[PDB]
Design a protein around this ligand. Structure first.
Ligand code: CA
Ligand code: CA
Ligand code: CA
Ligand code: CA
Ligand code: CA
Ligand code: CA
Ligand code: CL
Ligand code: CL
Ligand code: CL
Ligand code: CL
Ligand code: CL
Ligand code: CL
Ligand code: CL
Lengths: 311, 311, 311
């Protein structure tokens, strides 16, 4: 719902209320995961040349019992667009990495996940000062590039997107907080088809489950998806992350073990643009073992069912 | 304030800011209780037959000093209406019990209260999957029935409402998380008159003050109210809850004591639909004693005065 | 963005997203300070004579990492205007003192500060029941006066504003929670000029850094500011607070030391009404010493740069 438009100032005010339930043995899965989002995009125009924006999107849980809060700013930032010289926007905002990682982040419930938000760049973060440049100066059509800075520690980022005309797209991003991480992705967006795959390499994953970081991490994800016309986007997808020599902060070592790996059958049923329902079944592969045990890492297969209502 | 309506999508965005002060000796009463609510109802139509909704209402305190948060999702859920086959809506939502208990929940400040929110069904809760059916299939006019499911533990619910034409209404609901609870209510809604009374019986009340649960609990409430035409709804009301063999979780026992009992004189003065003022005087009866002492249960008479502004 | 107007009910819904970064050695300065505000003013008219309002403005940080909340109700209250007999509004609301203190609270980032919010009156507070009277009964034009009450402990307030025609304004307020505090201010608002200065005297400042209160506190602030016409309001400003015999709650004493003192060079660049950018450089003077050390009081010079986007 875009709620204000007068004198070159547009303000949209989105929200969703997803009521959903997990089913799995792992007792910190099975249960209600209902939550809602309240966000707001914004726009102010001055001039022909430049347009000023500003955005904010919050996630508040509705699974938590009364007297209790669960919530975080998903993003908050404010920027400036200059016509043909792209944009600058400072504040809590998706890492440049996510530019290419996002292509695989499209499953009905689970996905992305190999990185976290505040996983030292790969999804969101704080203090982020991005510059985006779209259509390379009005010069090379279809080629967009972004160069980022993260706050604290320090980090630099770069991402290069290219849809080789058509629906084929190639994806490349490098991110190096101070601990570099790489990323390549491919996506095919055509005749109600969606094929996307991406993977990446890193120095340290740090902030991971509850057990420190490796010295090398190897994450890969891929999904195929069709868009039926009565509304129904059955998605099957696979992703996995592998480790290296990993510390319990102090000592511990845990070594060479899988971090996450699963196949995913999923169906998202779009009623209309504003209401969806979805069913999602995570086919988990990981074996309940010391690494997973101590670090709380989910070893059980789960299946989630949810009724999303947006705006 | 309904803020968007285009193409069969309605979104209303309500809020209230109630500034109010308590007066009583009990030092965790006397004082400011100012708070605000921000909610949003929603609607998307597809088709003749079915309409998709979604709702959310938050209560944030304004009594708390700076650097501090007090807040909870009052409700969050998303559902589906099918024309003549009623509705389904999953998420944080009023227990089916409250269908009939609500009839007595109408006093200017205090009331309801014999149950809490997260009092194992009787008001709100989490994980709730309700089905409502109104006008019994378009067949029996004036007869609505709801059947519920609570999340975790597990629970089942059923509520049957009937306004015997006129303004007379009979109310019946049974709820049994796993610990059954019963409920009958009566309400008379006519010529600016409001007479409502309800009571109920239970297995265990659990989550109560700070001291475990009984083996049998007996709660009853009744209110009469007139609606004067310059705007003024003086309400007098009485309610009370009695206990059984009650544990300090471990041991303790406390036995057969009153849980809450009071008479209530109250006046709600409606200026216009959007601004009210109100005065409310709780005539408490409970005696400050071991049960009440240790369990913090309010034994003092309080009187509250507040200026509500909605939207 | 005023979002509803129908039938004498106006509801405005403001917000800002300020993305800004501090630069200083003090490690609890240098960094991201991004935050957003979401507020809402309201209005309902009934009648010729009286109009009912209600307000709410929240500040949520966007500097905090994910799974984490930072936030407070800036204000929440609801009131009543009677035409020529001014207004009453109860709830979390700026102390009457701030009526005159505010004149110096106008710098691009830092300022005000000699008092805090919940600094026993001088800025915001809880339980506040204000009465404002503007234009002294329609009688003495340009003379407004406010008389306040704070919640808990108890307090009384009074503030007298006068713009001696022109842009010259004289300011006077006294506030005495139970611990009196005084205030005089002067402001000159004319030909794109802004000159304002205020200072005040107190009994106890209490809630200050981390170290109790003095027996006498002496705070003074002054700013000059010009409004260039391409948009640019370079502001230079100076303020300082001095102490008396001050306790670590228990014992400690710390004595006669400066509390805060700095000169401020600042520029606020208004693009259009809805987007600003700003640069601000706090020239701090305080010496890192026992008082400051133990009480965490910022002894370092900082400079902040931010892109605000309102609505
Ligand atoms: Ca493009
Ligand atoms: Ca398995
Ligand atoms: Ca009916
Ligand atoms: Ca009594
Ligand atoms: Ca005036
Ligand atoms: Ca210095
Ligand atoms: Cl919190
Ligand atoms: Cl999120
Ligand atoms: Cl991870
Ligand atoms: Cl509530
Ligand atoms: Cl209870
Ligand atoms: Cl604030
Ligand atoms: Cl201070």
């Amino acid at each position: 719902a875009e709620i204000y438009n007068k004198d070159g100032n547009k303000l949209d005010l989105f929200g969703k209320v997803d009521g959903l339930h997990y089913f799995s043995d792992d007792k910190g899965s099975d249960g209600d995961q209902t939550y809602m989002r309240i966000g707001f995009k914004g726009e102010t125009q001055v001039n022909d040349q430049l347009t000023g924006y500003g955005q904010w999107e919050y996630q508040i849980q509705g699974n938590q019992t009364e007297g209790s809060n669960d919530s975080w700013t998903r993003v908050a930032f404010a920027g400036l667009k200059f016509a043909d010289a792209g944009s600058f926007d400072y504040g809590r905002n998706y890492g440049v990495t996510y530019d290419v990682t996002s292509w695989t982040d499209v499953l009905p419930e689970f996905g992305g996940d190999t990185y976290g938000a505040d996983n030292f760049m790969q999804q969101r973060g704080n203090g982020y000062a991005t510059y985006r440049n779209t259509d390379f100066f009005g010069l090379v059509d279809g080629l967009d590039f972004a160069l980022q800075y993260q706050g604290k520690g320090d980090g630099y980022g770069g991402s290069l997107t290219y849809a080789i005309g058509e629906g084929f797209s190639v994806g490349g991003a490098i991110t190096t907080s101070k601990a570099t991480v790489y990323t390549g992705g491919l996506k095919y967006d055509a005749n109600n088809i969606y094929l996307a795959a991406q993977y990446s390499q890193t120095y340290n994953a740090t902030r991971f489950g509850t057990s420190g970081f490796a010295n090398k991490a190897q994450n890969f994800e891929v999904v195929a998806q069709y868009q039926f016309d009565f509304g129904l986007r059955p998605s099957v997808a696979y992703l996995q992350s592998k480790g290296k020599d990993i510390s319990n902060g102090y000592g511990a070592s845990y070594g060479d073990q899988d971090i996450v790996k699963y196949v995913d059958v999923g169906a998202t049923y779009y009623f209309n643009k504003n209401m969806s329902t979805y069913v999602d079944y995570k086919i988990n592969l990981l074996d309940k073992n010391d690494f997973t045990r101590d670090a709380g890492i989910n070893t059980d297969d789960i299946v989630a069912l949810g009724l999303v209502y947006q705006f």
